[PDB]
Design a protein around this ligand. Structure first.
Ligand SMILES: Cc1cc(C)c(/C=C2\C(=O)Nc3ccccc32)[nH]1
Ligand SMILES: Cc1cc(C)c(/C=C2\C(=O)Nc3ccccc32)[nH]1
Lengths: 287, 280
């Protein structure tokens, strides 16, 4: 099938991205559709000596789905280049499990980083969202729907820099401007757009919806969306037009922007350039 | 879509159990928790049970798997299949209340070990017998592996995890267009390449499970990466005879792993082959 073809095609292939396994040394697990370990790499793409990196790999007992997502992630990361998108340095595929060598983000996930804090200003939180918005605009212009946008999938690198991560679920939408998934998806339901939940339709405008949930996650310093509401209740709660109330410590302008990200009709939502301009307008009231 | 239709249907019997009579305890595994249930189906007082629920941040796919498990468990009834007692959905999160298995998973239980080859064969036989029942009901399990078998009181095997199970009454096969969620190292060659699932692919998996049993919870195809399996299988390679395995036992595993599904033994014949080993 599609995967057997992709495995054979891949194993018979770019010396641009291949990295000798023997120059790579793995350490502790950072997190667990894959696993990530901290690692160190010798003579990595013209960097002399060792460079600290993260390494994405398959878990124990990988299904075909998981293998496919690793291969797809690899494929998206090759095409992609933005200060707010995680950087790929190479891959080991030749005599051992498939390993993707990627940018180490010293603070871990944005969720984790938010949860560890209190000291952060609204200005810091706005800058974070703005950085993410710029990365999303560049992926959107590259014709890619990310699908899985969430605090847990955004890394915080050196300097408190946002890095969009986890491209397993990203799809190319050059031709049709939407990605349609027949069977049930694997994005948490509390981050999915209404048309994704009901019609299995994913577009840049469902990324915007997700971005709205992510704003909520930022403003709450890593809260759990729809707290105490079971995922199965979401269908009915969304079509009957309910949305999350304004959280504390959230300004009127911000909340207004989350709601617009959550408009029932996709075409009525802001595109990522409007989101960035909107976030600038708030940043201007603080800096 | 299919899920929203199902969720509404489900929301709109003798399986409902009041939430306030159920007390959750420690996590047993990832989601399943130890729990206790007051006045569960005519049992007076408190009964120790397990409770299956949705993990944090469940995707539609996982929601559907939970609803599916519930729907299959309503229909199924055999000494070696985990038993469903009820469910809570009225308010709060969807919870399925199921038989508690005091020794946990068969993998964990094998790995903590003194057991005879007689004990090992009996384990396989009990599962084979449960598979036989499930095959008769026209159900393809798909996800059979030591981590999905439970060890209840008296060292009784309980087949578990029906999330991925599928009805094959009409067509006798289950064909999944997209990529499955069963680990590659337990999938039949036809499931790997053509996405085809039958009772004969369950037999292949049962073969892998025999291997797990005999090695006391060994990891299949050790030090071989999942992606190499495609090629290794199509070119005819199979796991070598493990240490401490009879000739007859191994012979049974290879026959489970025949390239052609119709050349593989049927569950009924495996229960016989194992009972013969039992007796000899
Ligand atoms: C210190 C730390 C904690 C965590 C969860 C991480 C995680 C990552 C990291 O450093 N680079 C990555 C690239 C892709 C996906 C995850 C990571 N790093
Ligand atoms: C003592 C213990 C450890 C573990 C992993 C378990 C697990 C289970 C248990 O008891 N009944 C179950 C029903 C369905 C799925 C898992 C379990 N029980």
């Amino acid at each position: 099938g599609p995967l057997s073809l992709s495995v054979d095609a891949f194993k018979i292939l770019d010396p641009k991205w291949e990295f000798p396994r023997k120059n790579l040394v793995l350490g502790k697990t950072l997190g667990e559709f894959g696993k990530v370990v901290k690692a160190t790499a010798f003579h990595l793409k013209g960097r002399a000596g060792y460079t600290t990196v993260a390494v994405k790999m398959l878990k124990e007992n990988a299904s075909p789905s998981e293998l496919r997502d690793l291969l797809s992630e690899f494929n998206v990361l090759k095409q992609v280049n933005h200060p707010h998108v995680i950087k790929l340095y190479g891959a080991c595929s030749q005599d051992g499990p498939l390993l993707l060598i990627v940018e180490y983000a010293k603070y871990g996930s944005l969720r984790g980083f938010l949860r560890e804090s209190r000291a952060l200003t609204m200005g810091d939180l706005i800058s974070f969202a703005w950085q993410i918005s710029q990365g999303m605009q560049y992926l959107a212009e590259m014709k890619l729907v990310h699908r899985d946008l969430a605090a847990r999938n955004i890394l915080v690198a050196e300097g408190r820099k946002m890095k969009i991560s986890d491209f397993g679920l990203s799809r190319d939408v050059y031709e049709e401007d939407s990605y349609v998934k027949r069977s049930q998806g694997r994005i948490p339901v509390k981050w999915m757009a209404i048309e994704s939940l009901f019609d299995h339709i994913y577009t840049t405008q469902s990324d915007v919806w997700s971005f709205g949930v992510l704003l909520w996650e930022i403003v709450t310093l890593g809260g759990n969306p729809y707290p105490g509401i079971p995922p199965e209740r979401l269908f009915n709660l969304l079509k009957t037009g309910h949305r999350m109330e304004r959280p504390d410590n959230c300004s009127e302008e911000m909340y207004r922007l989350m709601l617009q990200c959550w408009k029932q009709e996709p075409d009525k939502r802001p595109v990522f350039a409007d989101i960035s301009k909107d976030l600038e307008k708030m940043m201007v009231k603080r800096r």
